[PDB]
Amino acid sequence: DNQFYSVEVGDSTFTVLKRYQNLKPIGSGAQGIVCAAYDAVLDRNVAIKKLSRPFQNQTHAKRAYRELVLMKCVNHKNIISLLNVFTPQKTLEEFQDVYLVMELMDANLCQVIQMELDHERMSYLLYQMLCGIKHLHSAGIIHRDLKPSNIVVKSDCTLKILDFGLASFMMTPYVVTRYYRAPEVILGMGYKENVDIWSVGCIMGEMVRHKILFPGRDYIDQWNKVIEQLGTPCPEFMKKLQPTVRNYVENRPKYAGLTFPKLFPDSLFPADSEHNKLKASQARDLLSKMLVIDPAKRISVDDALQHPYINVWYREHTIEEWKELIYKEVMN
Numbered sequence: 400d401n402q403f404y405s406v407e408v409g410d411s412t413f414t415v416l417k418r419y420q421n422l423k424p425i426g427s428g429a430q431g432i433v434c435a436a437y438d439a440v441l442d443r444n445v446a447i448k449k450l451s452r453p454f455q456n457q458t459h460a461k462r463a464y465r466e467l468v469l470m471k472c473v474n475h476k477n478i479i480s481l482l483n484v485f486t487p488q489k490t491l492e493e494f495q496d497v498y499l500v501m502e503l504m505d506a507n508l509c510q511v512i513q514m515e516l517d518h519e520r521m522s523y524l525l526y527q528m529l530c531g532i533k534h535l536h537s538a539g540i541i542h543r544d545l546k547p548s549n550i551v552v553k554s555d556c557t558l559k560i561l562d563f564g565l566a567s568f569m570m571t572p573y574v575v576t577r578y579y580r581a582p583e584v585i586l587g588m589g590y591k592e593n594v595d596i597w598s599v600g601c602i603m604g605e606m607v608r609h610k611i612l613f614p615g616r617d618y619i620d621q622w623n624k625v626i627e628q629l630g631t632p633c634p635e636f637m638k639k640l641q642p643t644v645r646n647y648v649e650n651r652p653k654y655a656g657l658t659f660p661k662l663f664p665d666s667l668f669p670a671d672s673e674h675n676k677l678k679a680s681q682a683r684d685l686l687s688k689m690l691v692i693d694p695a696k697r698i699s700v701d702d703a704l705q706h707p708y709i710n711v712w713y714r715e716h717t718i719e720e721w722k723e724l725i726y727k728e729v730m731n
């Protein structure tokens with residue numbers, strides 16, 4: 400008979416294709432609920448993400464269309480691949496949800512962060528972020544929102560990025576984390592390719608320090624936590640900020656904060672063997688080239704890939720037009 404069946408998964412219903420069996424919730428996010436399942440056809444495990452009426456507003460719609468499109472276009476070993484897309488509804492009028500099926504990963508970075516990693520694995524994961532980011536950049540896509548929760552890995556230490564970043568208001572219950580947003584993004588002062596390097600540096604640091612580098616309730620708190628450790632930026636950086644903002648920043652208590660050996664002591668890095676000793680320094684060296692406020696002085700993706708620590712691996716539519724656009728893309 401029908402091709403789909405429904406299964407309860409908490410406070411929602413997953414009406415998926417019969418080929419997917421033994422649904423099990425693996426995570427929750429902004430777009431919706433995500434489940435792990437077994438695909439009888441391909442004979443392998445996969446992940447199923449359900450988009451509940453993605454056209455309910457421009458915020459969710461824009462993300463869904465953009466996701467659905469790039470997920471189909473872009474292709475790279477370090478960017479989650481889409482295996483299938485479907486909708487249990489038969490017509491546009493009936494259209495409601497969109498299900499995305501992808502390879503199943505074992506976990507996201509939030510989990511890896513809570514554990515110590517030899518230099519071999521840490522550098523490898525970091526190397527895969529740079530590749531993926533490099534690919535996204537070579538496609539004209541500047542993520543700008545890379546974070547531990549949007550990056551997943553497998554046991555064999557393989558890594559893939561989940562989403563494609565940004566391109567505003569929502570009644571949603573949960574907020575979005577911004578601890579990894581680059582300075583230029585926080586101060587809206589224009590950005591470039593190396594804007595992602597800042598995020599990678601925040602993640603690498605968290606992997607070391609095992610704790611969020613720049614916490615904070617709002618961007619006000621976040622900026623302080625940034626200068627409180629790295630120190631007030633140089634003048635050349637100030638003269639590149641709109642006065643409405645250059646005022647707020649320049650009228651903030653200066654710092655000339657601590658150096659890197661202080662921020663990331665040898666205690667955090669394994670310095671038992673001579674090999675690990677050298678890797679520590681190289682690691683801290685890269686950290687110091689990525690955690691730089693001024694983009695003009697922040698290392699780039701290609702130079703970061705050449706770093707010895709890493710080279711060892713070398714418009715506005717209506718909720719009716721959106722439904723249309725999204726439905727068409729789904730029905731390839």
Ligand SMILES: CCNC(=O)N1CCC(Nc2ncc(Cl)c(-c3c[nH]c4ccccc34)n2)CC1
Pocket residue numbers: 425426427428433446448479501502503504505506507509510551561
């Ligand atoms: C139980 C704690 N382990 C984890 O951190 N996770 C998160 C990653 C999950 N695996 C996975 N594999 C593929 C995709 Cl496409 C997604 C995924 C995509 N978007 C998500 C939003 C929230 C949580 C997970 C996802 N997630 C497994 C459980």
